Amino acid sequence: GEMEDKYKIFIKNAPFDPTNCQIKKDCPNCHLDYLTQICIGSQKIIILVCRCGYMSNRG
Amino acid sequence: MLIPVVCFTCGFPIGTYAAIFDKARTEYIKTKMGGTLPQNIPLDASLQIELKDLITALGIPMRVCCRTHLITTLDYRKYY
Amino acid sequence: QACYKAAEARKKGDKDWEKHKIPFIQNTRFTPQMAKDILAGTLTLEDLVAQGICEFITPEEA
Ligand SMILES: [Zn+2]
Ligand SMILES: [Zn+2]
């Protein structure tokens, strides 16, 4: 399975990589205007992450 | 290595005015820039000065070919 | 910081929380005067690097 140990480091770094795509969406935790979106794997799972530590799908 | 004696395309004798044209163009471009170093004058900026009326004053007609060859020909004395 | 302060007004109960936000701005520091100085010979690449207007990038860092 993915999203757990295959890309744990990348997913934890995704908010800080400046070459990652952003999305104009408010953050529930820190109330930030923008979020970081990623799309990993052949199932194209969409994960939204934040600098404060927020992450979609109960991260 | 010089401006041709005649126009390559039609044969009009553009070369009887070549020396006058070269010197007069030098003076005219210097007047338009206003006394600047030859290297501080960009090659691009001096080529945008219109030489229509200077060529007209030489007596050369309004032919596309003659003005092309009088304006664009490279001089070997300025490269060696 | 303006986003955080707008949120601080928003949660506490201010109905004008969104007026604290500022617009985002991104730009380069290269100016038309620098281009003019380059064409005049008074400005160089190693002088543009010296004040951090440009930098060198290899395919690794790209
Ligand atoms: Zn957040
Ligand atoms: Zn001709």
From TrEMBL, chain A:
<protein>
    <submittedName>
        <fullName>C122R</fullName>
    </submittedName>
</protein>
UniProtKB/TrEMBL annotation, chain B:
<keyword id="KW-0240">DNA-directed RNA polymerase</keyword>
<dbReference type="InterPro" id="IPR000268">
    <property type="entry name" value="RPABC5/Rpb10"/>
</dbReference>
<keyword id="KW-0804">Transcription</keyword>
<keyword id="KW-0479">Metal-binding</keyword>
<dbReference type="GO" id="GO:0003899">
    <property type="term" value="F:DNA-directed RNA polymerase activity"/>
</dbReference>
<dbReference type="InterPro" id="IPR023580">
    <property type="entry name" value="RNA_pol_su_RPB10"/>
</dbReference>
<dbReference type="Pfam" id="PF01194">
    <property type="entry name" value="RNA_pol_N"/>
</dbReference>
<comment type="subunit">
    <text>Part of the viral DNA-directed RNA polymerase that consists of 8 polII-like subunits (RPB1, RPB2, RPB3, RPB5, RPB6, RPB7, RPB9, RPB10), a capping enzyme and a termination factor.</text>
</comment>
<dbReference type="GO" id="GO:0006351">
    <property type="term" value="P:DNA-templated transcription"/>
</dbReference>
<dbReference type="GO" id="GO:0030430">
    <property type="term" value="C:host cell cytoplasm"/>
</dbReference>
<comment type="function">
    <text>Component of the DNA-directed RNA polymerase (RNAP) that catalyzes the transcription in the cytoplasm of viral DNA into RNA using the four ribonucleoside triphosphates as substrates.</text>
</comment>
<keyword id="KW-1035">Host cytoplasm</keyword>
<dbReference type="GO" id="GO:0000428">
    <property type="term" value="C:DNA-directed RNA polymerase complex"/>
</dbReference>
<dbReference type="GO" id="GO:0008270">
    <property type="term" value="F:zinc ion binding"/>
</dbReference>
<protein>
    <recommendedName>
        <fullName>DNA-directed RNA polymerase RPB10 homolog</fullName>
    </recommendedName>
</protein>
Automatic annotation (TrEMBL), chain C:
<comment type="function">
    <text>DNA-dependent RNA polymerase catalyzes the transcription of DNA into RNA using the four ribonucleoside triphosphates as substrates.</text>
</comment>
<protein>
    <recommendedName>
        <fullName>DNA-directed RNA polymerase subunit beta</fullName>
    </recommendedName>
</protein>
<comment type="function">
    <text>Catalytic component of the DNA-directed RNA polymerase (RNAP) that catalyzes the transcription in the cytoplasm of viral DNA into RNA using the four ribonucleoside triphosphates as substrates. Forms the polymerase active center together with RPB1. Part of the core element with the central large cleft, the clamp element that moves to open and close the cleft and the jaws that are thought to grab the incoming DNA template.</text>
</comment>
<comment type="similarity">
    <text>Belongs to the RNA polymerase beta chain family.</text>
</comment>
